[PDB]
Amino acid sequence: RRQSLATKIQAAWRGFHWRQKFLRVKRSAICIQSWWRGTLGRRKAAKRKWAAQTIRRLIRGFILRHSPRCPENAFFLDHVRASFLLNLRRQLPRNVLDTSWPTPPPALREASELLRELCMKNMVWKYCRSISPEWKQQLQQKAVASEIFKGKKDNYPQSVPRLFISTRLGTEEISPRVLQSLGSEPIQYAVPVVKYDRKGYKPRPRQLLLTPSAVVIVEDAKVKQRIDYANLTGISVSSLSDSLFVLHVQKQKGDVVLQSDHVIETLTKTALSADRVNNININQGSITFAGGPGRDGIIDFTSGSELLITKAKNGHLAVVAPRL
Amino acid sequence: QLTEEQIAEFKEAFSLFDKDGDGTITTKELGTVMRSLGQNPTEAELQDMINEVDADGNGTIDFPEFLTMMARKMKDTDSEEEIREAFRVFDKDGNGYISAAELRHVMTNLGEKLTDEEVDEMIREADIDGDGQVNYEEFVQMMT
Amino acid sequence: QLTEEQIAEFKEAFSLFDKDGDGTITTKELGTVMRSLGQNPTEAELQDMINEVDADGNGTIDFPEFLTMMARKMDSEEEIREAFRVFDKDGNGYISAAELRHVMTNLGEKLTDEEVDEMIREADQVNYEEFVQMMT
Amino acid sequence: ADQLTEEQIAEFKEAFSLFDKDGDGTITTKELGTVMRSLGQNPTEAELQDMINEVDADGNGTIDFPEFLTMMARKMKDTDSEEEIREAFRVFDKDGNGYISAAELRHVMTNLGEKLTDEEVDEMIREADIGQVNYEEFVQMMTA
């Protein structure tokens, strides 16, 4: 019996021994885990104390905002300094034509106005100095063209996006015999046009070459007229979505009418080279030209559904434009 | 037939000794667990319980069956008096004490025996309380 | 009743979590307030406090009621290092994350991953003492 | 798209018009000194010079302007700034939509600190409310 009984005793002690070792463990762990909730908890507090301090430091700064710099408004002041320079960087003006500037903090008005001026000059220098001389020519050319046409001619707008270029007419098309005759003058621009005679008003294909001295109107190789820039006074054009123009010129041939498929280009390029920029007329009614000598003619423009040039038995030159 | 309150407590210790946490525990573990939950099983009963469930020689024991074992053993456990009676037959002279020599002796030999490491743990625990020897009357009630 | 010096410390950190100057505090932040002075309650010490102070169901606490609770509960850093080194096996004053992680998530004040994950980031085998320098 | 427009003509003609009015010569570092002193800073010749070189583009003057601004903002000695403010209100915010409540905010300035008294500062809050406050609205108003 004693052996059976002795086991009971030992049985109890183990249970007691492990159980107490377990409770000791559970207790020792609830100690650290929740004593640590009060480590993290004690920081949730002290960061929510700083937060309160910062808000108040800011508002204390504000109330004192007219004071010379000091620890209290140092925060607030540096905040308006900071805020301003950021909120400008976000809202800077897109280019030289953005007048717009944002409204500033009362104190930094004086600074705002310094910055706005600085930014603009920076923008001006940045642009002018980075433009490629190729491009600079194009805008400069385009710019005069707008000056001349914008508003006043029903197809100037459609002209704008299609760039101007050097010669419209061929490496080979100029025919060597004409170049030799042409002399020690070069070709700044050439283009295919269509001539209409004085009397007949009939169609005749020709080439228009622009030399420094003069414009030259050339058949296949025969150079059928030279107009000097001194001898050419003005140019006249219709005000419709037309494609045609007249060259005013003074017992020798005088004015002449022509059509470029590239009209704005040719006409500006000419008026530049010939320095007759201010001497272009844009007629809404009719054009008068000296014509083939002793045979004055008149050109009557009218809108319509198609392009066609013809003469009618008034003797006048009837042009009919399309209309976009 | 099983209380909700009980399942909650037991689950904690199981899951604490369930290091890999598969929902099952080492057979060698099983002793330390039931005792940590406050029981007094014997390696006798352990082996019977371990052998029966671990019929297949997994060496593993899940928590659903673990509730049967705690429940089966809960059905009957030793009151203080029987344990008090248990010492009393090793206390020929009815003074209510026990030499820590006779104690060491009885424990290291007769029953489900204990090492010196174990026995030292029990003698300290069953403290001499002064150079002394081990009144069981105070100690037995203490283990409850 | 303790000299005014605590009371000053006591009111500011009582107020600082008072939502809008009323003199009342939500239940959820009675713990943090205490913690905000140097304590270490558990959710057992809390809940026992909460029901006894108010059974109103209000979910509030005024400053007399908070004063009283404080006197009652009025452990140093060593009480922590024991509570930690029990898990140490080596006796070298080191425990390792693997060991620590599983325990905390299954023992008395179980943590969700959030709370635990902060532990894992916290340092380093981790070092028993190292955390205590941080801990206190 | 990506084609020449009448707007571009305008831009070209204007920019060169301005270019003439302004100097041919490049931007001055003594120009820059004036701007910062305007903003309540006071750096040496050595510090001014250093700055211009850390903002450059191919052009004549051609300072990088956006990243120039940003460079001053560092010089403030209060880098925290907008970051610090955006936080501090959020800690007093239940729903993280940017709003705060007026009794709450009132509490902060009146009770904890040194009894800050509003003047206009009170006026602003009542304006921000449509109810409770909006920090974004509150601050933008206070810096003005």
XYZ file of N, CA and C in Angstrom, chain C residues 4-130:
381
model
N 1.136 69.415 -3.131
C 0.563 69.943 -4.371
C 1.358 69.546 -5.616
N 2.624 69.187 -5.415
C 3.555 68.987 -6.517
C 3.065 67.917 -7.490
N 2.530 66.816 -6.967
C 1.941 65.808 -7.838
C 0.725 66.394 -8.542
N -0.067 67.155 -7.787
C -1.382 67.624 -8.232
C -1.247 68.453 -9.510
N -0.167 69.227 -9.572
C 0.174 69.998 -10.761
C 0.460 69.051 -11.916
N 1.287 68.044 -11.655
C 1.674 67.072 -12.669
C 0.388 66.369 -13.073
N -0.413 66.077 -12.057
C -1.642 65.309 -12.175
C -2.715 65.974 -13.035
N -2.970 67.259 -12.800
C -3.977 67.988 -13.572
C -3.627 68.181 -15.052
N -2.381 68.539 -15.354
C -1.992 68.837 -16.737
C -2.154 67.629 -17.652
N -1.763 66.464 -17.142
C -1.813 65.233 -17.917
C -3.178 64.569 -17.788
N -3.993 65.069 -16.863
C -5.412 64.736 -16.836
C -6.149 65.506 -17.929
N -5.899 66.814 -17.959
C -6.485 67.737 -18.930
C -6.077 67.458 -20.371
N -4.771 67.369 -20.603
C -4.216 67.172 -21.942
C -4.952 66.106 -22.776
N -5.538 65.104 -22.125
C -6.384 64.139 -22.836
C -7.886 64.393 -22.675
N -8.237 65.455 -21.958
C -9.630 65.877 -21.896
C -9.976 66.541 -23.221
N -10.994 66.015 -23.893
C -11.191 66.274 -25.313
C -11.412 67.754 -25.621
N -12.303 68.403 -24.879
C -12.612 69.808 -25.146
C -12.861 70.679 -23.901
N -11.996 70.534 -22.899
C -12.009 71.382 -21.713
C -13.058 71.130 -20.645
N -13.887 70.112 -20.849
C -15.019 69.847 -19.963
C -14.604 69.458 -18.543
N -13.525 68.689 -18.422
C -13.190 68.046 -17.164
C -13.575 66.577 -17.161
N -13.958 66.063 -18.327
C -14.247 64.638 -18.497
C -13.326 63.944 -19.504
N -13.042 62.668 -19.256
C -12.114 61.911 -20.087
C -12.761 60.631 -20.557
N -12.508 60.257 -21.805
C -13.104 59.048 -22.343
C -12.478 57.867 -21.612
N -13.133 56.713 -21.671
C -12.615 55.529 -21.002
C -11.253 55.162 -21.575
N -11.140 55.255 -22.897
C -10.045 54.638 -23.627
C -8.705 55.228 -23.215
N -8.739 56.443 -22.675
C -7.509 57.169 -22.409
C -7.341 57.478 -20.935
N -7.931 56.663 -20.070
C -7.606 56.743 -18.649
C -6.259 56.068 -18.429
N -6.012 55.023 -19.212
C -4.774 54.276 -19.136
C -3.597 55.162 -19.488
N -3.664 55.749 -20.683
C -2.595 56.582 -21.237
C -2.241 57.729 -20.295
N -3.259 58.310 -19.664
C -3.060 59.411 -18.728
C -2.177 58.973 -17.561
N -2.533 57.839 -16.961
C -1.768 57.263 -15.859
C -0.339 57.036 -16.314
N -0.231 56.333 -17.437
C 1.031 56.025 -18.090
C 1.857 57.294 -18.269
N 1.149 58.392 -18.533
C 1.735 59.706 -18.792
C 2.300 60.382 -17.547
N 2.469 59.618 -16.473
C 3.059 60.153 -15.256
C 4.179 59.252 -14.762
N 4.184 58.005 -15.228
C 5.166 57.039 -14.766
C 4.638 55.706 -14.263
N 3.390 55.373 -14.579
C 2.834 54.103 -14.120
C 2.885 52.977 -15.144
N 2.348 51.834 -14.734
C 2.316 50.641 -15.558
C 1.076 49.801 -15.296
N -0.104 50.318 -15.640
C -1.240 49.456 -15.322
C -1.432 48.336 -16.325
N -2.265 47.374 -15.954
C -2.663 46.309 -16.854
C -4.146 46.513 -17.090
N -4.744 45.724 -17.972
C -6.154 45.912 -18.292
C -7.009 45.341 -17.176
N -6.361 44.676 -16.229
C -7.064 44.157 -15.072
C -7.182 45.267 -14.034
N -6.050 45.883 -13.700
C -6.032 47.087 -12.868
C -6.934 48.193 -13.418
N -6.999 48.325 -14.743
C -7.909 49.295 -15.352
C -9.362 48.940 -15.091
N -9.816 47.786 -15.574
C -11.252 47.507 -15.619
C -11.818 47.557 -14.199
N -11.022 47.089 -13.240
C -11.406 47.107 -11.833
C -11.621 48.554 -11.389
N -10.748 49.442 -11.862
C -10.854 50.870 -11.572
C -12.143 51.421 -12.180
N -12.385 51.072 -13.443
C -13.397 51.729 -14.270
C -14.806 51.548 -13.727
N -15.167 50.301 -13.451
C -16.523 49.994 -13.035
C -16.801 50.591 -11.660
N -15.818 50.479 -10.768
C -15.950 50.967 -9.398
C -16.127 52.489 -9.356
N -15.311 53.207 -10.125
C -15.387 54.667 -10.171
C -16.711 55.132 -10.790
N -17.073 54.535 -11.923
C -18.331 54.837 -12.604
C -18.982 53.556 -13.100
N -20.238 53.374 -12.711
C -21.074 52.310 -13.238
C -22.192 52.997 -13.996
N -22.048 54.315 -14.100
C -23.020 55.183 -14.745
C -23.251 54.742 -16.185
N -22.185 54.268 -16.823
C -22.221 53.949 -18.235
C -21.896 55.179 -19.051
N -21.530 56.249 -18.351
C -21.255 57.523 -18.993
C -20.098 57.418 -19.974
N -19.026 56.768 -19.542
C -17.801 56.763 -20.313
C -17.035 58.043 -20.044
N -17.082 58.511 -18.797
C -16.349 59.710 -18.396
C -15.708 59.569 -17.023
N -14.914 60.574 -16.671
C -14.166 60.623 -15.422
C -13.809 62.069 -15.139
N -14.335 62.600 -14.045
C -13.926 63.913 -13.575
C -12.707 63.827 -12.649
N -12.118 64.980 -12.349
C -10.823 65.047 -11.673
C -10.842 64.756 -10.161
N -12.018 64.814 -9.494
C -11.924 64.294 -8.124
C -11.707 62.798 -8.184
N -12.517 62.149 -9.015
C -12.554 60.705 -9.108
C -11.189 60.193 -9.533
N -10.554 60.912 -10.453
C -9.209 60.563 -10.890
C -8.167 60.802 -9.778
N -8.308 61.887 -9.008
C -7.424 62.114 -7.852
C -7.375 60.918 -6.911
N -8.548 60.474 -6.468
C -8.653 59.358 -5.535
C -7.907 58.110 -6.036
N -8.153 57.692 -7.280
C -7.581 56.443 -7.804
C -6.056 56.435 -7.699
N -5.469 57.624 -7.801
C -4.023 57.791 -7.844
C -3.343 57.457 -6.524
N -3.905 57.993 -5.440
C -3.414 57.764 -4.081
C -3.280 56.281 -3.768
N -4.320 55.539 -4.128
C -4.358 54.089 -4.006
C -3.093 53.422 -4.557
N -2.899 53.535 -5.869
C -1.793 52.881 -6.567
C -0.393 53.480 -6.313
N -0.310 54.633 -5.653
C 1.008 55.160 -5.290
C 1.613 54.356 -4.143
N 6.583 50.293 -9.365
C 7.775 49.462 -9.227
C 8.928 49.980 -10.082
N 10.121 49.999 -9.493
C 11.335 50.419 -10.188
C 11.763 49.500 -11.325
N 12.906 49.837 -11.916
C 13.334 49.289 -13.195
C 13.794 47.844 -13.042
N 14.281 47.508 -11.850
C 14.629 46.128 -11.521
C 13.447 45.166 -11.513
N 12.257 45.653 -11.172
C 11.065 44.805 -11.197
C 10.736 44.386 -12.636
N 11.375 45.050 -13.593
C 11.217 44.737 -15.006
C 12.214 43.669 -15.442
N 13.485 43.866 -15.096
C 14.544 42.945 -15.506
C 14.375 41.522 -14.980
N 13.739 41.365 -13.821
C 13.376 40.027 -13.370
C 12.297 39.480 -14.290
N 11.202 40.224 -14.400
C 10.077 39.853 -15.250
C 10.482 39.496 -16.684
N 11.671 39.923 -17.109
C 12.166 39.573 -18.439
C 13.094 38.357 -18.434
N 14.012 38.302 -17.473
C 15.097 37.326 -17.540
C 14.621 35.897 -17.258
N 13.415 35.756 -16.707
C 12.776 34.443 -16.533
C 12.638 33.657 -17.839
N 12.545 34.368 -18.960
C 12.405 33.738 -20.270
C 13.764 33.391 -20.839
N 14.793 34.041 -20.305
C 16.156 33.806 -20.745
C 16.432 32.345 -20.375
N 17.081 31.611 -21.273
C 17.481 30.229 -21.008
C 18.933 30.178 -20.573
N 19.759 30.927 -21.290
C 21.205 30.886 -21.157
C 21.621 31.306 -19.748
N 20.910 32.283 -19.192
C 21.385 33.054 -18.059
C 22.477 34.044 -18.411
N 22.573 34.376 -19.697
C 23.584 35.311 -20.182
C 23.020 36.730 -20.279
N 21.761 36.898 -19.884
C 21.031 38.118 -20.174
C 20.775 38.323 -21.656
N 20.424 37.239 -22.341
C 19.878 37.310 -23.695
C 18.688 36.390 -23.897
N 17.708 36.923 -24.610
C 16.593 36.157 -25.131
C 16.512 36.487 -26.610
N 15.833 35.657 -27.387
C 15.820 35.872 -28.826
C 14.395 36.030 -29.318
N 14.254 36.692 -30.464
C 12.974 37.239 -30.889
C 11.960 36.118 -31.058
N 12.372 35.076 -31.778
C 11.603 33.842 -31.925
C 10.928 33.454 -30.616
N 11.718 33.445 -29.544
C 11.245 33.012 -28.237
C 10.199 33.991 -27.729
N 10.565 35.268 -27.744
C 9.751 36.332 -27.175
C 8.416 36.506 -27.908
N 8.458 36.416 -29.237
C 7.299 36.687 -30.092
C 6.124 35.791 -29.745
N 6.385 34.490 -29.670
C 5.317 33.508 -29.586
C 4.649 33.699 -28.224
N 5.458 33.912 -27.188
C 4.946 34.065 -25.826
C 3.881 35.148 -25.737
N 4.278 36.359 -26.114
C 3.485 37.567 -25.921
C 2.117 37.454 -26.564
N 2.069 36.750 -27.691
C 0.835 36.596 -28.448
C -0.090 35.522 -27.862
N 0.433 34.697 -26.955
C -0.380 33.645 -26.334
C -0.525 33.714 -24.811
N 0.143 34.658 -24.147
C 0.036 34.719 -22.687
C -1.026 35.740 -22.256
N -0.952 36.216 -21.015
C -2.108 36.862 -20.412
C -2.671 38.119 -21.049
N -1.820 39.099 -21.326
C -2.233 40.253 -22.116
C -1.796 40.047 -23.563
N -2.481 39.159 -24.279
C -2.124 38.844 -25.661
C -2.035 40.129 -26.486
N -1.051 40.189 -27.377
C -0.938 41.292 -28.323
C -1.369 40.888 -29.739
N -1.911 41.839 -30.497
C -2.095 41.651 -31.936
C -0.795 42.008 -32.638
N -0.705 41.689 -33.927
C 0.561 41.744 -34.645
C 1.140 43.140 -34.513
N 0.295 44.141 -34.757
C 0.667 45.552 -34.654
C 1.605 45.802 -33.475
N 1.122 45.506 -32.267
C 1.856 45.807 -31.039
C 3.169 45.038 -31.036
N 3.075 43.759 -31.390
C 4.216 42.849 -31.399
C 5.266 43.265 -32.419
N 4.808 43.701 -33.587
C 5.699 44.011 -34.699
C 6.626 45.158 -34.317
N 6.116 46.087 -33.514
C 6.927 47.187 -33.009
C 8.071 46.618 -32.167
N 7.796 45.545 -31.422
C 8.819 44.902 -30.594
C 9.969 44.404 -31.444
N 9.615 43.757 -32.550
C 10.598 43.082 -33.377
C 11.535 44.120 -33.999
N 10.972 45.239 -34.451
C 11.763 46.357 -34.948
C 12.637 47.000 -33.867
N 12.206 46.887 -32.613
C 12.721 47.740 -31.541
C 14.233 47.658 -31.309
N 14.817 46.466 -31.419
C 16.266 46.320 -31.248
C 16.794 44.970 -31.719
N 18.074 44.964 -32.095
C 18.816 43.764 -32.487
C 18.015 42.806 -33.367
N 20.130 37.725 -32.017
C 19.531 37.746 -30.688
C 19.296 39.162 -30.187
N 18.115 39.414 -29.629
C 17.899 40.681 -28.949
C 18.592 40.587 -27.593
N 18.829 41.724 -26.955
C 19.448 41.730 -25.635
C 18.471 42.105 -24.526
N 18.492 41.333 -23.440
C 17.580 41.536 -22.314
C 17.736 42.943 -21.732
N 18.973 43.314 -21.407
C 19.263 44.602 -20.776
C 19.065 45.764 -21.746
N 19.414 45.547 -23.014
C 19.430 46.607 -24.029
C 18.069 47.277 -24.114
